[PDB]
Structure formats: C-alpha cells, structure tokens
Write a protein that binds this ligand. Structure first.
Ligand code: PRO
Ligand code: PRO
Ligand code: PRO
Ligand code: PRO
Lengths: 272, 272, 268, 268
C-alpha cells in the first residue's frame, strides 16, 4: 500500500463504454490527466476504439496489460460481467494498485472478495456525466486511504460533483441520483406540454422548460438556501406562482416524487 | 429613430432593484460596457446606492437626469408603479432613446401608449438571473429595430438565455418560465424528502436532489434530444428508473405539471 | 443446413395460425403449395386444400417429408404430440413452435435436441400485420434464423429476443391488441358523444389509429416528437392530450402491460 | 364535367399537406407531375421540383392552367388569397379547401360560387394513411365528389360528411393521432417496466397498434367482438383489459375527443 503518485499516476479503464469515455474526456479536458497517462482495452469494437483514440488515448488489446501499466484501475463493465472480469485479472491486482468500480448494484464487500484485497473504491455516478454535471457518490474499501479518496474526488470532480457515503446507502442513492434524471425529463416534457396547452409555440415551450429547470436547480445549488425559502422568494402574494404551486399541492405533487424515489430504491434493493 | 451607437451607447436604469443590479453587473463583468457608461437613480436607499457605486456606477438623484444622459433606458420598477413613472418622464422619452421594460404583466401596447412612441422592447426574465441562468423572452415594439433587438440580446446575454416571442404569449410564458422555478423548488425538496424516506442522510439527499435536477436539465439543454429520448436512454429493462417512472405515471405526474402551468397562466391573464 | 430455396415445410396443427402462415408464405412467394404439407375436421381440410396444399392423414408422414416442422397445436397438447413424434425428429430437421407459454428449455427436452426455434406471433397475422418475436434453441443456426425470419416476415414483422422476455412480450404484443380494440371503441363513442354519426365515428377511429401507428413505424421519430408535431399552440390536439394526462392515461396502459405480463408468468 | 383522366391540378399553398397530396397522387398514378402546378420558401420549390412538378411564380397562373384548385394556405391567410384570385375562379374550375376550421358557407362567399369541396385530412397523409372527410358545396357534383375521393384516396381513406360535423371530426381524426402516440409510448414504457429492452418494446408497441387497427379496418367486426376474440378465459389479455377498465380507460379517451371537439368549436 504505497501511496499513488498524485501528479503522475496512470489510469486504466476496464470497460470502454460511455461512462469510461465521459470520465476520460472530462479528466483530460480539465487537465487532471493527459491522454498519454490513460489506457483502455477493446476487443470487439473498432467504433469504441475510435472514440478513445480520437482523444489521444492508447487502446491496448488485453485487459491484462491495461492493469500492468496502470496505478489506478476503473472497472466499468456491465455489472453481471464484473465478477468474472475481476477474477480473471486477480493475480495482476496487486495492493499497490487502487481499484475503482462504477458498476451499478455491486457492493463493496463483494468487490473486495473478488479482488482479494480492500484497496477499492466504489463510485456511483449518473447519466449527466456526459455534460460534466454528474451527481456521484463514493464509498471506500477497508484499505482505501484518504489520499486514495482525494485522488478519486479529483478524478470524478471532472465529470460533475462527488460526495462520500457509506456503501449501505447506495440503493437509495440509486433511486434518487441514479434514477432521478428520468423524473426530470418527464417534468420538462410536461412543462413544455403545459406551455403549449396555454398557447405557447412548441419550440419556445420546450426551450423555456429546460432552461427554467436548469435555472432553478442552479439557484438551489448556489444560493445556500433551503428549497422552502427559495419557493418563498418567488411566491408573490396572490400572484401567478402561488396559484401554480397551489395546484401542485392540491394534487399531492411532493408525495408523488417521494413515491418515485422510494419505489426506485426498493427496486434497487430487490435487484439485490 | 437614429440607430443606437453599438459601442458607445449610455445605459440608464430606472428602478435599482435586484434585476437591474444583475443586468448591470453582468454587462460590466462580460465587458459589454464600462461602469462609466451606466447611470441609475436612487432616492430612499443608501444600501442600494452602495450596491451600484461599489461596481463603479454613478448614482444620480433624479430619474429625469438618468433619462437625459442615456441612449437606452431600462425600467425595472415594481409593475404597479411603472405607469406613473413613465407618464412623469414622458417629455424626456424622445424617439432617439430605446426603452426597455422588464416589468412583469405590462403589455407592449400599454408601454407604447404610456411612452407615446413605439421604440420599446419588453423583456421578461425570471429569478435565475441571479446566477446567470435566467430564461428570458423579449418582444419588440412597432418601432424597435433588429439592431435594437441585438443590442438588447447582447446586453442581457450575461444573465442567461434569451428567446424572442410575440407579446401575446407573455401570460403563458409567465406561467412557465416565470413561475416554473417554484415548481422545481418543490420538486427538489420532495426528492430530498424521498431520499430521506429511503434511508439517506438529509444533507446528502438535498445535495443529490439539486445536482440531479441540474444535471438532467443540462442534458436537456445541451443534448439536442427530445426529453422522451433522454428518458428512454436511462430506463433500463426492469430496472430502478422505470420503477420510479411508473409511479409517476400512475399518479398522473405529467398532468399535474400541465395543470400548474395552465393555472398560473390563467392567473397571469386575470391579473390583467 | 436447410436448403434455402427448396425446403419442404410441415405443419403439425392445422389451426388459424398455421393457415395464416401457409397463406402468407404462398402469397409472398417464399413457398409454393406443393412444398407444404399438413395433417377429424373436414372444414380445416378444405381451408388447406383450397390453397393447393396436400393434407396427409398422419403427423408421422408430415414430419418424414418435411425439412422444417411448425408445431401449432394447442399448448397443453404439444408435449404429448412431440413425444409421440420423437423418433422421427432427427437433427437435420429444423423444428419451430408457435405455442403460447411453452419455453425453449422444455421444447428442447421433449424433442431431445436443440435445433428448435420458438416464435410468438399475435392475432394480426390474419391480416399480415403480426408483431412476432423469435428465440433460438442452442443448436439453431443463423441460417435457420434467417429462414424463419423470412417465413414469418410473410405474416407481419419479426424480431429476435431471448426466451426469458416471452412473458413480458405476451403482455405487450400478445395482449396489446385488445387494449387497442377498447381504445377504438372508446374513440368512436367519443365521436358520437361529440355529435358524430356512429358509422363515421367508428371508421374514423380505426383509420386514425392505423394512420398514427404507421407514422410511428415508418417515420423514424420518437413518439414524443410525433406528438409534438401535431400539438399546435392552444389548439384542439393539446386540449385532448391534456385530458389524457389529467387522468394518468399513460400510467393506465403501463399497468395493463405489467398486469398481463405478471399473469403470463403465473400461467407459468 | 371536369375531365376525369386529363384534368390539371393546381396547388395554392405549397406546404407539407400539398406535397403529401401531390406525391400520393403521382405514386398511385391518379396524376402525372406534368399535370400538376404550384406557386414563401426557395426550399419548398425543391421539394416540388424534385418530384417533377412545375413551380410557377404566381398564384394567378396556377389557377389559369388548372381545372381543379387545392387551397392549403394557412387558414388566417385563405380569405385574402381567395378574394385576390376571385376574377379567375370561374365556375368551370372545381375548388378545394383543406384549411382547418374554414366553413363551407365562407368558402363559397369568398369565391362567389358554390363549386367548392372541403376536405379535412390528418397528419398520416405523410405515409398514405390519412383519415379524411369531405363536405360538398351547393354546386359540387357527384362527379366532382368522385374526382376528389380518388385524389384523396391516394393519401389514405376518405369519407363524406356534413360540414356541421367538422369540429367533432377535428377532435377525433384530426387530434386522435396524438392520443395514439401517447399510447404507443406508454405501451413501450410498460414493456420496459415488465423487463423488456427499450428498442424491442417500442418496435412491438408500434406494430401491435398497427396490427390491431388493421384488424379493425379489415375484419368487418365490431371492436367488442375483436376484443372477445383475443380475451382467453382467465388469460393474460383479460388481466390487462381488467386494469384498463378499473381505471376508466374508455372514459378518458371519450373525454379527450369531447374536449378537443369543444376546443375546435371555440376556435370558431
Ligand atoms: O409570483 C408571481 O406572480 C411572480 C410573477 C412571475 C414570477 N413571480
Ligand atoms: O434503471 C436502472 O436500473 C439504472 C440505474 C439507475 C439509472 N439506470
Ligand atoms: O392541434 C390542433 O389544433 C391542430 C388541428 C388538429 C391537428 N392539430
Ligand atoms: O389472453 C391470453 O392469454 C392469450 C395470450 C395473448 C393473446 N390471448
């Protein structure tokens, strides 16, 4: 358990999907890494190979060599495949390498057993990694150090925001930050549909819906205010806003979003 | 109707509230122009005076003089006060001066009648101007030129996004981009409450809710995809996301947000 | 490997579905009636003979003379029919089941080999607009799959899917037509409620549904984008869409598919 | 009589609908491009020229050279366009409006005669599956009606109805497609909710809806009878139907048609 060189470490991606690509592009764009310090492996796909080569990253032909040449290894293969991929690589997963999983649903306990050591970090990002606005959370294996954690905070700080949480919260986090985008995509469509129902042109309605939601969320993220206080700031007496809010409350809007989160968290638990 | 000098115009703020401050700071930050080209008038308030002076803007003691010395005049007084303010200034509101109103609910027809001419532009921003992510729309008076329009698009561009729309759409716009932030503030709180209901710590739940909403909206604003396609991208077969979406649909979630927009638009129309 | 242009096809079970597949294959020229065989009912006999197909008197002989065998007997009877024919079901013969609810695992065990394809069509086979899905046994080849794609392309559209999805498919493409029959009737009733004559209302409802689905199948657009294209500002379409959304219309159709899939699973 | 086999057709308004009609009429051989003429975008010129149709530079000349004239300009513009052309709108020329919301009474007053037919198509014209209805001006002949049935039979189906029904028709065939687009999406979402892949779920949802509607349009059966045909005892289909009925599904689609019809009436 030698510390990972903060400025000079090499990063290996096992699994070359969208999420790996988003992390690699983000890390390069923000200067956390240069492409020469990143490796990935691809077998079947010439298209995925292009995506990585086109940003200056060397694509090797085996997972084995990616691991050998990497200080930090990020596993992003489909969850059902991960176990076998880890077991295959096990002899090369020496304790001087920091391992990271972004696989949905795979608990720390299992990651550590498969790898045979506890220098492992688990990250659950979400779909907004693509535009650098992910909501990510990380949990630490029993041998992951504070310096390991900071290294991974910096890496994933390049695709959005990142927080720390106990592994036991990850089902619930899945129902909120993992699944929540889709609740907001519905909301944006419905707002647009509402604008059209009130007489707006479709393109304007949709533009305004998206940006209105973006704006409100930015107010929430930056203002340091409770959401109740933000709602109080825009609800003028007997005005348009409070009329709309009242309809939401009549229908139990808040409860409906609570139910979604809860059901999704419950499904996450059931999928084990 | 001489064109406004694009590089050398002077700007006057009648009404020195948060919205005027935001536009002024933004314009200066982004280099659209220097504080020396900007004037505002304040009577009662030494605190509002500080806010403007502290960014290098000269505060005069009368509205009359602000207008005299300005090519472009932005009215941001409370809507109920606007009519009387305009009527008082009317002799000074000559056709060579481009007028702009950010007042909620005041129609172009009325602006033009009060001012006695048609070189008037109406801008309806929303509350996210504070963090530079406003959803704004502009309508043009009968004598406002394309160049006038561009001058305003550029002036305002510091506070968010701006779209052009007929004045007749503005009641409805109020129900969507004006009032919509409060719908999202409810949504953020409800998502947080949902996370806590599923076992998450409050601070994490709130941080995730806000950033999950921000991320989704960013995906919608940048991706070029229909919201339905974005939802389809994140709904894995039999997964957590679709379970949550299903609860939203069972409850008529989209129809509720439509009802809010429509009721708010209806209230806007009733408030005249 | 089955001869692509000269194979013979045998139908075990001579019901509506087998008739539809036979007629479709002939109409479209995939097959000539002389290349088709099938095996109490004089009326069913007529249906096959009337399109030029030879009706034999035993299942055994249909199998002997066929490269490809399609089983369309009632599901509860299939096991015994297959076990009876087993000695004749040699590996050079591609077997196909259209039986509702019978898993690939079971088909393969009954036959004693894995050169088996499962197809689940739906009721619209009758008018050549079936929504069908196929799963492949462990020894079914790509060429076997293409042969069956071509055969069932003659009665509608066909897609590939893992056998494990077949319960859920049943709740969507199997059961979905009924959801649409209710919708057509309710649309007609709606037209009448708004003052239209009944015959017109019904004609419009059916052809409106047909037209919309054709737009969906051919446009390459997401349904949401299609809905956006027709929803004029403050117009008639959006007013109607708003009533749907107030009532949770989407959710109700999701519930139907989910409950039907759950029932399919329970029926094993 | 308009010459049934040799008439020339003129499009005043060169939007999507006019393009769909022109392409349909050509594809099906009702017309050759040389027998069609049209007269706001240099891009729209390409769309018509690219299928062999001559674009003229004035509405006046389109009319002069046409036996049959189809008005597809935006409804608010139609009155002024007709009034401008009035001296050229002689009684030997059959006039047609596809403009939403414009009553026969008004069309006839603007044109100064009653040899006018009104057609309300819907969005599925683009794929040749429109649901259209026509009403006849006081001087439109049976032969005029047949000519227009044939023309619009090239973009889907067409029925006759009194002008007074056109608000309600709008709520049903005009607005209905969107109801179906929501249905298709919801059925796909339902499939995914039951475990299906998205692409398969969507493909199946669209084709299932297309198939069902084809059964309705071709079978000659009442929708209730078609629902009875697919609802097996205690099976998957009836479990899904039951969920629909628990929620009042039929009523919701009735509400949509009614509210849309009401809005059409309000938009005058
Ligand atoms: O609550 C209201 O009426 C004002 C107007 C839109 C934004 N807030
Ligand atoms: O739907 C699912 O299961 C995955 C996990 C969260 C986002 N998509
Ligand atoms: O939404 C509307 O008003 C138009 C007319 C029917 C189809 N779309
Ligand atoms: O209702 C049932 O169970 C069968 C299966 C789908 C079509 N009808």
């Amino acid at each position: 358990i030698i510390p990972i060189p903060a400025d000079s470490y090499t990063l290996g991606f096992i699994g070359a999907g969208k999420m790996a690509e988003s992390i690699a592009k983000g890390a390069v764009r923000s200067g956390v890494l240069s492409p020469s310090r990143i490796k990935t492996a691809i077998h079947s796909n010439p298209a995925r190979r292009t995506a990585f080569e086109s940003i200056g990253i060397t694509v090797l032909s085996s997972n084995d060599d990616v691991v050998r040449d990497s200080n930090v290894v990020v596993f992003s293969v489909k969850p059902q495949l991960l176990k076998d991929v880890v077991l295959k690589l096990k002899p090369l997963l020496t304790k001087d390498k920091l391992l990271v999983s972004v696989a949905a649903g795979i608990k720390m306990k299992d990651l550590q057993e498969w790898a045979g050591h506890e220098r492992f970090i688990r990250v659950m990002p979400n779909t907004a990694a693509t535009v650098g606005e992910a909501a990510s959370v990380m949990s630490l294996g029993g041998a992951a150090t504070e310096e390991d954690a900071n290294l991974i905070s910096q890496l994933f700080g390049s695709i959005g925001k990142i927080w720390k949480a106990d592994d036991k919260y990850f089902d619930a986090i899945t129902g909120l930050s993992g699944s929540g985008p889709a609740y907001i995509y519905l909301a944006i469509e419905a707002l647009a549909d509402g604008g059209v129902a009130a007489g707006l042109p479709r393109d304007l309605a949709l533009s305004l819906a998206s940006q209105t939601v973006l704006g409100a969320a930015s107010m929430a993220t930056q203002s340091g205010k409770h959401p109740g206080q933000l709602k109080d700031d825009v609800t003028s007496p007997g005005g348009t806003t409070i009329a709309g809010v009242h309809e939401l409350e009549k229908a139990g809007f808040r409860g409906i979003l609570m139910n979604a989160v809860v059901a999704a968290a419950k499904r996450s638990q059931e999928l084990s």
